[PDB]
Design a protein around this nucleic acid. Structure first.
Lengths: 148, 51, 89, 238, 38, 121, 384
RNA sequence: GAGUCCCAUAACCUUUGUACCCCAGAGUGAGAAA
RNA sequence: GCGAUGAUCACCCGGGUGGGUACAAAUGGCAGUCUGACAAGU
């Protein structure tokens, strides 16, 4: 049987009319490191960027890539386990995160993705209605969120 | 129909003898079905017309 | 049944080319093949639907095509089209 | 449209126990377990078969959220011939009768309801279908009716409650097979009207997952309903 | 259409009623619109 | 236990009798038992309002059956006599129906009252 | 630390002994969960020690009530006492946490477990069912669960066979079928006996009367003054048929049929008589039930008419649910409720809808409201 | 030589007789009387 | 001394036409009752 996934009802074309404050933001492994590099620690750094309350989510994978990093990246782990950071459990065999992160926004058009890996950015750019947030310069930047 | 004449209610089915109506193997099936039956109790007002 | 009735075959042909029957009706693109097993059934109304969705006994026909024959609008609609196409041909 | 004289061709659907009636319009239909009558006034097909007059019922997708899912095009429907199904939130026989038709005489339907008033008609429907077992009891306490339900292959829950995930889990742990079917209908307004639908569905798929249900699919039921979906999942105990 | 010369056509290798009249026309009638429509 | 169940408390009735009033002004209100049934049959009823002191009560216990089949909230007020003025109409009303309209001026407090009614249920 | 497990079956109570205890730390491991599915592995965990079937249907329901309310029945107290040792404290697995305190009260020496480990064993027992009973007579659980279903669920709602209205739908269906059959067979009797004595067919047009006369007048040749008085007693002599049949029978045209032929006529005529006799009995039956089932609706319009309205809607529950306008057209094909005339027909339709609501949603409907609700229709009728 | 297995024991149409109906139909929904 | 427990709202000349529903009858229509000298064995 042929399968043609429906376009989400939360989309008027490439506007996502579902993501409204408070937001859900997924964190990528590289993002915690770069945030530490630019000293833009997690929760308020958004609050200045977005002017709205967001809910940071770390996947079982992302908590795992942070923890493959090793003793050199200890700071990222304690920041990753902040109680305000909820956890998105995963039920797929691979521990590979970039396919993990994108695949959720394929299902549900209700998340922002936090990333600085160029590996993962353009994947979100084709898919419509997925706001894309990154750390650049001195603070975070949001690309595909018109509400800003 | 002849069964209903002999037994009016499933309670009667347990002891009523169906030999002249049904063979030995069949007549015990209705007896076992009667106690594990599904239907609800019916009045004698109802039972009279069914007979 | 093997050696099926011409009446059933014509009904199947009507369903296959359902798109052309009405100008204001359009359908999803489908490659419909005759099913390996099928039956021919009739639609029965509830009594409350007597006025709304019940056609008269005289209008009823055993086979679909005859009901299409009774509809005058379909016949008028189509007589125009067949003349127009033959002029081009 | 579908008027009394109009004649239709019945051909099978991809899902076993589901059928399509062609014509000027296409109808989703299921064969009638009790020929000669309609349960909620639905429409019916009668076919002459060698000759016995077999009877088929029209499934209105607007009334039945599952049927809207079939119109939505579900890849997998665990409800199938010779399979035990536990129907939660069975308001009446509007949909359960159709589910009873899909499972067949070999199958049974365990219909669970809470409110007494809809239960009376559901019981009246239950007699006409020997395969339907009505359970007029709160689904929040599966231990109340563990006495009455044997081991079940699939669970259908259309309960419109905020705590549906807890209800689904407890019934799934007690009754559902390993690798068994889970098929839920979710409305966003009852669970959480404050936030959009999409975040709700993300939250629900999350709750199913701690409960050891592997979710397989999701379908919003537009154009038939706003802010619904049907999520299909498999219960992974091991 | 093509009119092949006979000499070429010689030298080829081998390989290369009443109610129903109303109900049989209407079929070949409807088939033409669907073909033209598509 | 009672047939008239759930019955809104003194406070909740007031907000319900409020939303009833602006609805009469905005043509969103179908009142009377049979109209409630018709709005129910077409499925345009977001929730219904009925009176607990109907004489006899039994002439409006069809509506709970219709709604619970389809998942529409319903709630009872102590007085059919009180439900009259909220409709804006010179005679008592035992049952009335507010209809679905996402294009209505008075949506926000409807969903506020509609939020409370399910909590009561 | 589990030793005994209490499992309830719709046929009865079976308690099990836990021979081996499954690993508690590794409960969520893949392999142990598979062991629950595998029958061979499970039988090593537990064994059947007892089973106490219920005596009958009544016990299963009242225990089904007791199990649900976390209560201990006399049967539960009986089975447990013989099994669990008095004993530090014997451990029993129960699916229900609420049942635990009840067991402890009766039996201070038993400690109950309902943790996931206990649930794991209980799930397996239900999975295999009677396969674990190892041949013990449990009948078969599936119909017992189904049988206990309308025993359990349908008890809580408090219906009654009083509520049941299918008595009215089948009675009206049977009544009309009888009406057709009595006419069909009776008219045949005219043809059979018409050959033998045709003009008696025209003398007594009433079909039921004719069958009786044929039963007495089997042979038109037999004509006596005493017989004339006997057939004169049949019906009345005001029509004069008693004298006509004698005068006709003397000078008649019908061809004599054989003794076997006449035997079929009276025997067939006797069959016609019985069906009419059963039909009047069923007619009186239909009247009594509606006063019991729908006193309001029956009083307003009548028994026979109301029974037809119930059948058209399909049930009394159905008729109550529709709006008034639908009810009016429900009987607009046989003129059940029938410009000024139409107003009364709708006016009666509105009140008939109410009477169905009162009858349907009242456990013991009365005719007090039906009596008055007819009276306003009478006031309505007089004004128009 | 040859269809019981699509009720010629029948389906449909026409004519005739009997009994009802021509108000809308998921009928509408606030006037009516003065 | 009212009303949401419901107010209000096909043709022709009192009659004839026209139409719908249900039942019954027709030895009324479809509708016309297959072929005809070989078969089987040593």
């Amino acid at each position: 049987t042929r399968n043609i996934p429906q376009v989400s009802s939360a989309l008027f074309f490439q506007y996502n009319q579902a993501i409204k404050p408070p937001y859900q933001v997924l964190i990528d492994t590289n993002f915690i490191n770069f945030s530490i590099q630019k000293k833009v620690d997690i929760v308020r750094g958004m609050m200045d960027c977005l002017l709205a309350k967001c809910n940071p989510l770390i996947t079982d994978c992302v908590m795992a890539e942070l923890e493959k990093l090793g003793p050199k990246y200890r700071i990222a782990l304690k920041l990753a386990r902040d109680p305000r950071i909820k956890r998105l459990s995963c039920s797929h065999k691979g521990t590979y995160a970039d396919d993990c992160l994108v695949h959720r926004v394929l299902q549900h058009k209700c998340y922002i993705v936090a990333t600085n890996d160029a590996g993962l950015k353009q994947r979100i750019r084709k898919i419509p209605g997925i706001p894309l947030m990154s750390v650049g310069g001195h603070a975070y930047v949001i690309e595909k969120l018109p509400d800003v | 129909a002849r069964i209903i004449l002999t037994m009016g209610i499933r309670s009667k089915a347990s002891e009523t003898d169906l030999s002249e109506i049904l063979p030995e193997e069949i007549e015990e099936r209705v007896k076992t079905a009667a106690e594990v039956s599904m239907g609800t109790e019916i009045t004698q007002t109802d039972l009279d017309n069914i007979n | 049944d093997d050696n099926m009735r011409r009446e059933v075959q014509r009904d199947l042909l009507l369903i296959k080319h359902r798109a052309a029957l009405d100008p204001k009706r359009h359908y999803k693109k489908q490659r419909w093949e005759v099913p390996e097993r099928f039956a021919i059934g009739t639609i029965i109304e509830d009594k409350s639907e007597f006025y709304s969705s019940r056609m008269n006994r005289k209008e009823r026909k055993s086979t679909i095509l005859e009901t299409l024959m009774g509809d005058e609008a379909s016949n008028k609609y189509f007589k125009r089209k067949y003349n127009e196409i033959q002029e081009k041909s | 449209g579908a008027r009394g004289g109009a004649k239709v061709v019945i051909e099978p659907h991809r899902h076993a126990g589901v059928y399509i009636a062609r014509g000027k319009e296409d109808l989703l239909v299921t064969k009638n377990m009790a020929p000669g009558e309609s349960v909620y006034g639905e429409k019916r097909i009668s076919v002459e078969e060698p000759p016995t007059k077999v009877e088929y019922r029209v499934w209105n997708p607007f009334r039945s959220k599952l049927a809207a899912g079939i119109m939505g095009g579900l890849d997998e429907l665990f409800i199938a011939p010779g399979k035990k199904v536990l129907y939660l939130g069975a308001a009446s026989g509007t949909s359960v009768s159709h589910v009873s038709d899909v499972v067949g005489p070999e199958g049974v339907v365990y219909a669970v309801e809470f409110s007494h008033r809809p239960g009376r008609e559901l019981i009246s429907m239950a007699k006409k279908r020997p395969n339907i077992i009505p359970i007029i009891e709160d689904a929040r306490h599966p231990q109340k009716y563990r006495m009455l339900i044997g081991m079940v292959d699939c669970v259908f829950a259309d309960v419109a409650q905020p705590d549906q995930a807890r209800i689904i889990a407890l019934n799934s742990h007690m009754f559902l097979k390993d690798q068994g079917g889970v098929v839920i209908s979710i409305k966003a307004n009852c669970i959480d009207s404050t936030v959009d639908a999409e975040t709700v569905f993300a939250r629900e798929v999350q709750k199913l997952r701690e409960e050891r249900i592997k979710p397989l699919e999701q379908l919003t039921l537009e154009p038939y309903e706003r802010d619904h979906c049907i999520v299909v999942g498999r219960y992974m105990r091991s | 259409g093509l009119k092949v010369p006979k000499a070429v056509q010689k030298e080829l290798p081998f390989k290369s009623g009443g109610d129903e009249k109303k109900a049989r026309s209407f079929i070949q009638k409807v088939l033409t619109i669907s073909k033209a429509k598509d | 236990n009672p047939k008239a169940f759930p019955l809104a408390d003194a406070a909740l009735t007031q907000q319900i009798l409020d939303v009833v009033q602006q609805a009469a002004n905005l043509r969103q209100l179908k009142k009377g038992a049979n109209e409630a049934t018709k709005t129910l049959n077409r499925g345009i009823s977001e929730f219904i309002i009925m009176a607990a002191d109907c004489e006899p009560i039994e002439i409006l216990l069809h509506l709970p059956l219709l709604c619970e089949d389809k998942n529409v909230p319903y709630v009872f007020v102590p007085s059919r006599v009180a439900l009259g003025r909220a409709c804006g109409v010179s005679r008592p009303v035992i049952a009335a129906s507010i209809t679905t309209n996402d294009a209505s001026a008075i949506k926000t407090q409807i969903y506020a009252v509609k939020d409370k009614i399910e909590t009561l249920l | 630390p589990i030793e005994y497990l209490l499992f309830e079956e719709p046929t009865g109570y079976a308690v099990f002994k836990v021979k081996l205890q499954q690993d508690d730390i590794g409960s969520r491991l893949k392999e142990v969960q598979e062991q629950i599915n595998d029958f061979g592995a499970f039988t090593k965990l537990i064994e059947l020690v007892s089973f106490a079937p219920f005596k009958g249907a009544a016990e299963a329901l009242e225990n089904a009530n007791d199990i649900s309310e976390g209560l201990v029945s006399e049967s539960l107290k009986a089975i447990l006492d013989l099994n669990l040792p008095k004993a530090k404290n014997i451990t029993l697995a129960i699916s229900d946490k609420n049942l635990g305190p009840s067991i402890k009260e009766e039996f201070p020496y038993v400690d109950c477990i309902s943790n996931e480990l206990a649930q794991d064993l209980i799930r397996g027992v239900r999975l295999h069912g009677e396969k674990l009973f190892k041949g013990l007579q449990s009948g078969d659980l599936e119909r017992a669960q189904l049988g206990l279903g309308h025993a359990y669920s349908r008890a809580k709602v408090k219906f009654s066979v009083q509520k049941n209205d299918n008595h009215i739908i089948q009675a009206i269906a049977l009544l009309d079928q009888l009406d057709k059959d009595i006419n069909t067979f009776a008219m045949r009797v005219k043809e059979w006996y018409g050959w033998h004595f045709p003009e008696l067919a025209k003398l007594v047009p009433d079909n039921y009367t004719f069958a009786k006369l044929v039963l007495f007048i089997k042979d038109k040749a037999s004509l006596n003054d005493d017989s004339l008085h006997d057939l004169a007693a049949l019906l009345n002599e005001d029509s004069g048929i008693a004298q006509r049949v004698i005068d006709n029978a003397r000078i008649s045209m019908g061809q004599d049929i054989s003794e076997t032929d006449m035997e079929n006529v009276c025997v067939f005529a006797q069959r016609v008589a019985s069906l009419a006799d059963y039909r009047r009995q069923l007619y009186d039956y239909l009247c009594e039930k509606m006063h019991t089932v729908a006193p309001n609706l029956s009083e307003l319009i009548g028994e026979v008419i109301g029974a037809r309205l119930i059948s058209h809607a399909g049930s009394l529950t159905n008729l109550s649910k529709q709006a008034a306008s639908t009810v009016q057209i429900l009987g607009a094909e046989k003129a059940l409720f029938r410009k000024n005339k139409g107003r009364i027909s709708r006016y009666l339709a509105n009140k008939c809808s109410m009477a169905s609501r009162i009858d349907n949603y009242s456990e013991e409907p009365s005719n007090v409201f039906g009596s008055v609700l007819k009276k306003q229709v009478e006031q309505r009728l007089e004004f128009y």
